[PDB]
PDB file of C-alpha atoms and ligand atoms in Angstrom:
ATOM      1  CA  UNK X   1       0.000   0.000   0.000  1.00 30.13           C
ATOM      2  CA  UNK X   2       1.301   3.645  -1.198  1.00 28.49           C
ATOM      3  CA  UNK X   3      -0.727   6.454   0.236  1.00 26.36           C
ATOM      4  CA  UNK X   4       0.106   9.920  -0.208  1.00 23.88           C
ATOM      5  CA  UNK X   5      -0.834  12.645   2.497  1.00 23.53           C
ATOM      6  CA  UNK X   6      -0.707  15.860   2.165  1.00 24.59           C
ATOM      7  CA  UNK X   7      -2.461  19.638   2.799  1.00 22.01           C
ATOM      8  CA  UNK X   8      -3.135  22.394  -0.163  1.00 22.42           C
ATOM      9  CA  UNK X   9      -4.921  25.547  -0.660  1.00 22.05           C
ATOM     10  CA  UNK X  10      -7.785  25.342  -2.824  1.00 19.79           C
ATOM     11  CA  UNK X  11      -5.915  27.016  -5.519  1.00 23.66           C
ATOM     12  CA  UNK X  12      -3.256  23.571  -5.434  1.00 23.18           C
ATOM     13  CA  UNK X  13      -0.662  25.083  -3.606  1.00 17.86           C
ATOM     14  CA  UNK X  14       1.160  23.185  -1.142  1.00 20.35           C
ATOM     15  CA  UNK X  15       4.210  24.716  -0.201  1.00 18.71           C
ATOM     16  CA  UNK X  16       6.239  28.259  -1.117  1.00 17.48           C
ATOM     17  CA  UNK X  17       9.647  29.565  -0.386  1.00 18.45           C
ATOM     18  CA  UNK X  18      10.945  25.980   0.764  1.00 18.57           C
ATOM     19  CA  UNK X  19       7.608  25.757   3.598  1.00 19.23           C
ATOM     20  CA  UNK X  20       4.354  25.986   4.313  1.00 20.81           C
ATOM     21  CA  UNK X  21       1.833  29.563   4.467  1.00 20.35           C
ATOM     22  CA  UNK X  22      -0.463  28.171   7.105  1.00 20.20           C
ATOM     23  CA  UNK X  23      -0.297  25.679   9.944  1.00 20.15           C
ATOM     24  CA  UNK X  24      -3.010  23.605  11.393  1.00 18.92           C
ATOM     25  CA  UNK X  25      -2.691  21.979  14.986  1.00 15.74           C
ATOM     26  CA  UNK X  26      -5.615  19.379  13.701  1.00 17.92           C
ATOM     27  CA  UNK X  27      -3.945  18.701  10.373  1.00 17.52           C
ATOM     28  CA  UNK X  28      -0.613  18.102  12.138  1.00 14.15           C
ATOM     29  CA  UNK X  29      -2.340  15.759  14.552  1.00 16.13           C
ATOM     30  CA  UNK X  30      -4.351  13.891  11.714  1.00 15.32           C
ATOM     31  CA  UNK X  31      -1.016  13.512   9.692  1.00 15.60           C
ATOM     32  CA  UNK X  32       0.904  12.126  12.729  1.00 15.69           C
ATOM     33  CA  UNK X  33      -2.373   9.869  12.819  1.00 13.18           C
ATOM     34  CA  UNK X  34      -2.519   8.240   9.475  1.00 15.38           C
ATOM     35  CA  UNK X  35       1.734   8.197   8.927  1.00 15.46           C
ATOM     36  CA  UNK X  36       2.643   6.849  12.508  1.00 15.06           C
ATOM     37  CA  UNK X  37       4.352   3.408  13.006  1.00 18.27           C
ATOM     38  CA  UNK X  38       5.186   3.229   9.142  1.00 20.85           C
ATOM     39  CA  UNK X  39       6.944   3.901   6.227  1.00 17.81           C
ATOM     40  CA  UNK X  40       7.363   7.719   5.470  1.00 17.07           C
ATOM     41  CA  UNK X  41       8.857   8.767   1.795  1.00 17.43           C
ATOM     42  CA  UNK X  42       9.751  12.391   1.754  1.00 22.37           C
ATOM     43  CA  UNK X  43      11.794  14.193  -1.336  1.00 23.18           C
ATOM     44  CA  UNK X  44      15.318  15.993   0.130  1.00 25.00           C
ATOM     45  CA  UNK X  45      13.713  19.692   0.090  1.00 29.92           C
ATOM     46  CA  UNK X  46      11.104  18.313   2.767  1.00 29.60           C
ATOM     47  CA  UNK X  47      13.277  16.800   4.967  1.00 33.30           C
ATOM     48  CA  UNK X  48      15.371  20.205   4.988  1.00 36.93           C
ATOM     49  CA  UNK X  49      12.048  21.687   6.323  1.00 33.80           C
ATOM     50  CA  UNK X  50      11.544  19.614   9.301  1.00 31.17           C
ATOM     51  CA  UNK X  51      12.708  21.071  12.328  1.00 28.02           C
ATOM     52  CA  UNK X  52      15.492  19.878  13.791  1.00 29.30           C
ATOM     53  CA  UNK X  53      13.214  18.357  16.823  1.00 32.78           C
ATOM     54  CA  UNK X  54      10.894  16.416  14.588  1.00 32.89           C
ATOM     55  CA  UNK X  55      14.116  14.572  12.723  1.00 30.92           C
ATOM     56  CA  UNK X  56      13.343  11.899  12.222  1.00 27.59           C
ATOM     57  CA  UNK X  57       9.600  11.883  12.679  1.00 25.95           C
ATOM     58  CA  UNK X  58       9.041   9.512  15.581  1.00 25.79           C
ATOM     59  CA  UNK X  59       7.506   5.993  15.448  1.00 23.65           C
ATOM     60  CA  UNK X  60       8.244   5.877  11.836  1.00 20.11           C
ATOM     61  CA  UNK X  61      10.708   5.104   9.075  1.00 19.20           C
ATOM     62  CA  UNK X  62      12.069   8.025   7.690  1.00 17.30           C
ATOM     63  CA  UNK X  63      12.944   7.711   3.911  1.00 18.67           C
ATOM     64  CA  UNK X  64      14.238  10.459   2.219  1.00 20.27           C
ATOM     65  CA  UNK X  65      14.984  10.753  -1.695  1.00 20.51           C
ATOM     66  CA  UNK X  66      17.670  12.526  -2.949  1.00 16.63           C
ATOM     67  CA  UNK X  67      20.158  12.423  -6.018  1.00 16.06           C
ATOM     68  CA  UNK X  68      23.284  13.402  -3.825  1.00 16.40           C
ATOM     69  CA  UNK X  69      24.939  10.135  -3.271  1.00 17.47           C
ATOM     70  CA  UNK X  70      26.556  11.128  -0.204  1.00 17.12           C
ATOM     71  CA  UNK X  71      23.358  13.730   1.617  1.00 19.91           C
ATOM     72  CA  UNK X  72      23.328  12.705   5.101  1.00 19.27           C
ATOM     73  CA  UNK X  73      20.151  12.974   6.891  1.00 19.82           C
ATOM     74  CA  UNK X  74      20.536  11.956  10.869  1.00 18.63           C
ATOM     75  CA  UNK X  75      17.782   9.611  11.634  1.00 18.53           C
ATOM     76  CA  UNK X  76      16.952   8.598   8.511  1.00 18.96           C
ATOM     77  CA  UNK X  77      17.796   6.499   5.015  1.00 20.42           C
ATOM     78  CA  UNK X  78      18.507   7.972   1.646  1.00 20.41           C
ATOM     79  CA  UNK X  79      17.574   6.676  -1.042  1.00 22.63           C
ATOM     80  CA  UNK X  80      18.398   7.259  -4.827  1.00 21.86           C
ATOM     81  CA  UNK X  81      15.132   5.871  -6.436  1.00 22.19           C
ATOM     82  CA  UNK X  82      11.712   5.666  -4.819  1.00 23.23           C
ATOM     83  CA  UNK X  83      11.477   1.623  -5.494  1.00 24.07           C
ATOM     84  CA  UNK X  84      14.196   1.332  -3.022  1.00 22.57           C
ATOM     85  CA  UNK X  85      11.765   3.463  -0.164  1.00 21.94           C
ATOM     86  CA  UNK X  86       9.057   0.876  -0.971  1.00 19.55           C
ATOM     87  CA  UNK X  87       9.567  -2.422   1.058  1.00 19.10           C
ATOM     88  CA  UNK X  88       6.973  -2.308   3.877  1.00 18.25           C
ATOM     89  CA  UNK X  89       3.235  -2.837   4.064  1.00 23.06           C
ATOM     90  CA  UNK X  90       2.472   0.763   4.562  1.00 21.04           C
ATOM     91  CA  UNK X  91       4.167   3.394   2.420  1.00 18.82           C
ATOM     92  CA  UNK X  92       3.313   7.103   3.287  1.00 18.84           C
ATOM     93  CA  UNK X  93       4.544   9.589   0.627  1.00 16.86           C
ATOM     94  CA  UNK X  94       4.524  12.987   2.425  1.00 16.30           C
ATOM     95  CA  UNK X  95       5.996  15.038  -0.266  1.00 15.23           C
ATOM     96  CA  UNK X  96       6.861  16.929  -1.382  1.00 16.04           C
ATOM     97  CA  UNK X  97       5.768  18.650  -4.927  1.00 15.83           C
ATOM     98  CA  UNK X  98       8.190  16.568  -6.788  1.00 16.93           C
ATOM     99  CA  UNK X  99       8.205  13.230  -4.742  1.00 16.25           C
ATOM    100  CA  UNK X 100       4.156  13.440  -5.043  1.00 15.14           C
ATOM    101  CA  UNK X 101       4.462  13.222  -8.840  1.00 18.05           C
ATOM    102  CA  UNK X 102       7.041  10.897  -8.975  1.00 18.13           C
ATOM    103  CA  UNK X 103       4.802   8.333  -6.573  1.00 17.11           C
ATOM    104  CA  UNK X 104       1.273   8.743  -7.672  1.00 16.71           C
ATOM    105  CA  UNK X 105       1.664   5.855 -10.428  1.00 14.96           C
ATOM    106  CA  UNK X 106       2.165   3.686  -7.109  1.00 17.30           C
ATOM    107  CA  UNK X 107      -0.607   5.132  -5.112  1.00 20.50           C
ATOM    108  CA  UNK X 108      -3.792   3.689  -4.485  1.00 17.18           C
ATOM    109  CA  UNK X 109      -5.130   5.865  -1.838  1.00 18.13           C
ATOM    110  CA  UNK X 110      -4.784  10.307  -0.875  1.00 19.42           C
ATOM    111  CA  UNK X 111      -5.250  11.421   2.175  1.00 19.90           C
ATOM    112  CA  UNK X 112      -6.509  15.117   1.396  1.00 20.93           C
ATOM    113  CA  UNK X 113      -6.937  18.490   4.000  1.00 20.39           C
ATOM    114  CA  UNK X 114      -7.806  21.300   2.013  1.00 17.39           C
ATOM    115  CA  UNK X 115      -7.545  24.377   3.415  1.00 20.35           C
ATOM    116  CA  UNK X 116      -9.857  26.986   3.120  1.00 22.48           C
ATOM    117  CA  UNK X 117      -7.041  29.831   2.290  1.00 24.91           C
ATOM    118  CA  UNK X 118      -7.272  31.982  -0.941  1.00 23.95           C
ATOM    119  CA  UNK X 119      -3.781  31.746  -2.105  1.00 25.38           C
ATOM    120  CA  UNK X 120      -2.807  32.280  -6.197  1.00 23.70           C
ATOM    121  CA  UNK X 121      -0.068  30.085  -7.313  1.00 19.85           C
ATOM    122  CA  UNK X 122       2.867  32.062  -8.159  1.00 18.29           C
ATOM    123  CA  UNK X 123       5.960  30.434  -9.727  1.00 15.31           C
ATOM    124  CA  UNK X 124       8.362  28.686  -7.352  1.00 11.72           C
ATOM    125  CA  UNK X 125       5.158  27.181  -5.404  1.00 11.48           C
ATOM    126  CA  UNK X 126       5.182  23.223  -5.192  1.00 12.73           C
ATOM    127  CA  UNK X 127       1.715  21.868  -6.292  1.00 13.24           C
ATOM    128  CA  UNK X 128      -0.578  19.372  -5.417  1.00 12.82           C
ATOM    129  CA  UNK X 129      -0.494  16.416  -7.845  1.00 12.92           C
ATOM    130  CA  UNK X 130      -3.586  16.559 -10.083  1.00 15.82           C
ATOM    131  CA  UNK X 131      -5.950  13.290  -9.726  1.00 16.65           C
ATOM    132  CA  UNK X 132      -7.428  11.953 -13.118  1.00 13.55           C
ATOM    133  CA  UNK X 133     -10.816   9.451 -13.636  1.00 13.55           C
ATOM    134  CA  UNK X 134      -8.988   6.591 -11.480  1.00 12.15           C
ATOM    135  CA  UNK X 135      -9.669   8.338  -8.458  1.00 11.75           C
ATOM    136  CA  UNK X 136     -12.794   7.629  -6.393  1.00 13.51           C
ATOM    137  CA  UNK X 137     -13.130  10.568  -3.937  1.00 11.00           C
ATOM    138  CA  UNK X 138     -15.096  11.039  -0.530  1.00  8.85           C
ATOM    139  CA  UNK X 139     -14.752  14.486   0.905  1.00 10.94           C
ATOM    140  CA  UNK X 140     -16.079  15.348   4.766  1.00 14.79           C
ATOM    141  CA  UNK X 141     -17.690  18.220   6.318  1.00 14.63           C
ATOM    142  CA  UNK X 142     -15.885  21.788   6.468  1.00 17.77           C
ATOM    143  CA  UNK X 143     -14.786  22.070   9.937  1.00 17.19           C
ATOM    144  CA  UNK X 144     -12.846  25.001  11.689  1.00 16.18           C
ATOM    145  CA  UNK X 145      -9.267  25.219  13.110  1.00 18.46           C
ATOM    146  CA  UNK X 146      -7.870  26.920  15.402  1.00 23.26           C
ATOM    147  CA  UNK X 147      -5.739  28.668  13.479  1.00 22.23           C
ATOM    148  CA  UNK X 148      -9.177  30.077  12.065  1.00 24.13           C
ATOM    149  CA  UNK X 149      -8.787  28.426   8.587  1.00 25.93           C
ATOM    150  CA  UNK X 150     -11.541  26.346   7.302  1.00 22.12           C
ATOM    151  CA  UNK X 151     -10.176  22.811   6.394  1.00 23.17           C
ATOM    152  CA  UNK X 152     -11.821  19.360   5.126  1.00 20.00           C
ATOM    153  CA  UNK X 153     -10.149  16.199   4.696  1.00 23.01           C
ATOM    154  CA  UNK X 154     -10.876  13.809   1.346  1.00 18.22           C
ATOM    155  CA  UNK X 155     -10.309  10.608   0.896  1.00 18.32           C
ATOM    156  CA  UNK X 156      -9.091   9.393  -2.585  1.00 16.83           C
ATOM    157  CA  UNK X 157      -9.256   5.469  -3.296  1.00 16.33           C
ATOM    158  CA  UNK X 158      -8.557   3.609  -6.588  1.00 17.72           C
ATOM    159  CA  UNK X 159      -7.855  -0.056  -7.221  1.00 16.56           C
TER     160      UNK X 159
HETATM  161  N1  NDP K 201       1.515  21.029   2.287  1.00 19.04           N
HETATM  162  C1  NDP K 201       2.067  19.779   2.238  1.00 19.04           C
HETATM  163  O1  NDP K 201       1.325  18.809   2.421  1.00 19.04           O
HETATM  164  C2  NDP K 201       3.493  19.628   1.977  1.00 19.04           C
HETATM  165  C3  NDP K 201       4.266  20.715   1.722  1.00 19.04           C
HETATM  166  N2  NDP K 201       5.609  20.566   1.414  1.00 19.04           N
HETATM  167  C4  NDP K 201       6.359  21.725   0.898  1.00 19.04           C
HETATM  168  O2  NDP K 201       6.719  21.450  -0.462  1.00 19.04           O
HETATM  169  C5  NDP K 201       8.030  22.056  -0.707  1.00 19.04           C
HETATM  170  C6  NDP K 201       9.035  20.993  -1.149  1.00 19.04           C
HETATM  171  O3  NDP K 201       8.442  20.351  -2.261  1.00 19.04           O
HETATM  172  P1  NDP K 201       9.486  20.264  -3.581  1.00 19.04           P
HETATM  173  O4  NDP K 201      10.097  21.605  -3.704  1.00 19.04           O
HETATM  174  O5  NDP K 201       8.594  19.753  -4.689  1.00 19.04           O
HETATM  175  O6  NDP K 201      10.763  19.364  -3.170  1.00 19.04           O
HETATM  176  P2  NDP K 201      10.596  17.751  -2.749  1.00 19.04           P
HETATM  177  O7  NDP K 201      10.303  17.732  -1.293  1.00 19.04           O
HETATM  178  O8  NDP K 201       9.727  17.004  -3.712  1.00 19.04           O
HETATM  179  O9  NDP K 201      12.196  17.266  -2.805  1.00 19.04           O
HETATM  180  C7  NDP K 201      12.739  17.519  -4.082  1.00 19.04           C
HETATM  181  C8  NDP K 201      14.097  16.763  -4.033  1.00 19.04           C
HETATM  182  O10 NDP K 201      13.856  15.369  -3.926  1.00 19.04           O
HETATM  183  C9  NDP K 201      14.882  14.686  -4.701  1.00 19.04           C
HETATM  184  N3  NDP K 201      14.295  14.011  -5.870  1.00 19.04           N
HETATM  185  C10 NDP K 201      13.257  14.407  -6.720  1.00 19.04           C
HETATM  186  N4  NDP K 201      13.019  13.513  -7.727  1.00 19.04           N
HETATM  187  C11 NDP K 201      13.963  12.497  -7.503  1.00 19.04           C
HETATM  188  C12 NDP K 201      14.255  11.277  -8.167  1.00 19.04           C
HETATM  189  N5  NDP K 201      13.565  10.858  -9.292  1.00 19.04           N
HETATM  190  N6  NDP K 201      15.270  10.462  -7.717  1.00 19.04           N
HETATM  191  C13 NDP K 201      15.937  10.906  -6.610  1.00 19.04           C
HETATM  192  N7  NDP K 201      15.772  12.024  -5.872  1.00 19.04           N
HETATM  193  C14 NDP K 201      14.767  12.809  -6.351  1.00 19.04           C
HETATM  194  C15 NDP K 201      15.954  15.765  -5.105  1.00 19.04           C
HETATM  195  O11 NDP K 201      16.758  15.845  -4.053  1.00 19.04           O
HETATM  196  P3  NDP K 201      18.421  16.419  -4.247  1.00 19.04           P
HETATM  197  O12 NDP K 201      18.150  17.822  -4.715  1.00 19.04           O
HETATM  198  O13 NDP K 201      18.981  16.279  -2.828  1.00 19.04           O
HETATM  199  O14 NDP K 201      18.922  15.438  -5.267  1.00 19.04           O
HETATM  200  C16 NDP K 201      15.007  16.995  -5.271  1.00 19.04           C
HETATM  201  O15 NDP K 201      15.734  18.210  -5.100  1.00 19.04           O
HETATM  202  C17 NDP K 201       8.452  22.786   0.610  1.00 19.04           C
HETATM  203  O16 NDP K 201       7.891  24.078   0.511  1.00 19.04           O
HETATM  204  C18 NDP K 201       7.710  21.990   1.672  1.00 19.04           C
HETATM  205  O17 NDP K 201       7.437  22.758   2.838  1.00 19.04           O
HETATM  206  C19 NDP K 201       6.224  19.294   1.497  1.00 19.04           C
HETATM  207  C20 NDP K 201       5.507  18.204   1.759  1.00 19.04           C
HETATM  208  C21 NDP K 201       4.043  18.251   1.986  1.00 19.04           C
HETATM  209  N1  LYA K 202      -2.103  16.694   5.812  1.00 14.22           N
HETATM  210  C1  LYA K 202      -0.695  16.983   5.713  1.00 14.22           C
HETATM  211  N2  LYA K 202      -0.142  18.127   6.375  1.00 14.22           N
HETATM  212  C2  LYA K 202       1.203  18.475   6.333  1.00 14.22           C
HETATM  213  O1  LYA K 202       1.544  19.460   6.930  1.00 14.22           O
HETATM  214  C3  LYA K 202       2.119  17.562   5.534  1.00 14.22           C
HETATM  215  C4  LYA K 202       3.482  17.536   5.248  1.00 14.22           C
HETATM  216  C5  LYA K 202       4.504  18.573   5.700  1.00 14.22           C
HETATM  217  C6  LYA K 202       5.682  17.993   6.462  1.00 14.22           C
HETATM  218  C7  LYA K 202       5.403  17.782   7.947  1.00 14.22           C
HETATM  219  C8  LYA K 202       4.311  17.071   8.448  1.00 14.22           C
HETATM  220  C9  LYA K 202       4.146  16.950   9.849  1.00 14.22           C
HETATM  221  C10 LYA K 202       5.078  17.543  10.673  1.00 14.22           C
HETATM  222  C11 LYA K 202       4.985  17.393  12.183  1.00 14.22           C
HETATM  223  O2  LYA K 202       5.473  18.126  12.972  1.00 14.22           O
HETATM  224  N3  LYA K 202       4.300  16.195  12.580  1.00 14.22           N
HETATM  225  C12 LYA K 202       4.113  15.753  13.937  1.00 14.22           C
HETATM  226  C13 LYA K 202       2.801  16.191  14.541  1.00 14.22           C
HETATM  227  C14 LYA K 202       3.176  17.180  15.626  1.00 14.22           C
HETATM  228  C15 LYA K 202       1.927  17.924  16.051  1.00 14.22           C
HETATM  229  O3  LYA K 202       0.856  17.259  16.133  1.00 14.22           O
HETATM  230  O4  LYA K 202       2.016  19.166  16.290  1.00 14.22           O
HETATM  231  C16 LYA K 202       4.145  14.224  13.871  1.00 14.22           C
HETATM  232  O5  LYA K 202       4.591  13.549  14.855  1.00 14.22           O
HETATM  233  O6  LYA K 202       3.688  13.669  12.827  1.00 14.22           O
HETATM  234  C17 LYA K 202       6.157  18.221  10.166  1.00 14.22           C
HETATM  235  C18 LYA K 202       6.311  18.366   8.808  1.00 14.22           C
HETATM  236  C19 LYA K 202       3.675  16.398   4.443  1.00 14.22           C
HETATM  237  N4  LYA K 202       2.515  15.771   4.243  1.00 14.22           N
HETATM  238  C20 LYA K 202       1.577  16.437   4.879  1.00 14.22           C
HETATM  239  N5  LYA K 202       0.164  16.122   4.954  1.00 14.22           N
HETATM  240 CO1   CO K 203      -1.734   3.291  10.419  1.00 13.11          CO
END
């Protein structure tokens, strides 16, 4: 099983300037939820955001692609190809823009939050991967966050 998990605007945008423009407590918790105890595949740029408390991500293997043969990342592996990140029941890909392309031919299910932020793309942004007629989609009530944002999780399935 590949999942991927992640949290956009509604305009696609999931990450600018190397992080994130928002931050939800409840998305936070709900990732730690679904991603805890297994596989997590992130591309090199996301692991560089993580703070330096959260690396590695507890409770979970940390996988993290990168090109650079010899990129250490303390607490986790890294990988050269995402096949290689692949050998374990559950397979998280958290991101990020690039990763998310590269895995969705392995995916069979997206874990979804959008958040209810008006933000235009602007060039530099990472994206959301776009989800063609494969994808069979339940979406859950808008519910508020702290942070004030409106956000709504979806849950994308195929076979
Ligand atoms: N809102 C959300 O849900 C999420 C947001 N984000 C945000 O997204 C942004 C990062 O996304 P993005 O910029 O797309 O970068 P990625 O996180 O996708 O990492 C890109 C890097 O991954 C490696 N990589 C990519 N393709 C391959 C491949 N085929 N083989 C091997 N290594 C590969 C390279 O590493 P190297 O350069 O070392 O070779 C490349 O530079 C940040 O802003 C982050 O905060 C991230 C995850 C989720
Ligand atoms: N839906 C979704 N939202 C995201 O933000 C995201 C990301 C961004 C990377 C990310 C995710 C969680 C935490 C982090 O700190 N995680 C903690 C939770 C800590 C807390 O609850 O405050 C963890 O243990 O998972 C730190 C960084 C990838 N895929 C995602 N998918
Ligand atoms: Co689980």
């Amino acid at each position: 099983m590949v999942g991927l998990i992640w949290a956009q605007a509604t305009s696609g945008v999931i990450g600018r300037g190397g992080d994130i423009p928002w931050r939800l407590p409840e998305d936070q918790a709900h990732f730690r939820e679904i991603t805890m105890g297994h596989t997590i595949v992130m591309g090199r740029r996301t692991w560089d955001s993580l703070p330096a408390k959260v690396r590695p991500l507890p409770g979970r293997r940390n996988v993290v692609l990168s090109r650079q043969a010899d990129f250490m990342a303390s607490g986790a592996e890294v990988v050269g190809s995402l096949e290689e990140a692949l050998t374990s029941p559950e397979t998280w890909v958290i991101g990020g823009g690039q990763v998310y392309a590269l895995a969705l031919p392995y995916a069979t299910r997206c874990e979804v939050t959008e958040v209810d932020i008006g933000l235009p793309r602007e060039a530099g942004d990472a994206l959301a991967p776009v989800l063609d007629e494969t994808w069979r989609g339940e979406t859950g009530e808008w519910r508020f966050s702290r942070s004030g944002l409106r956000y709504r999780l979806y849950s994308y399935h195929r076979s």
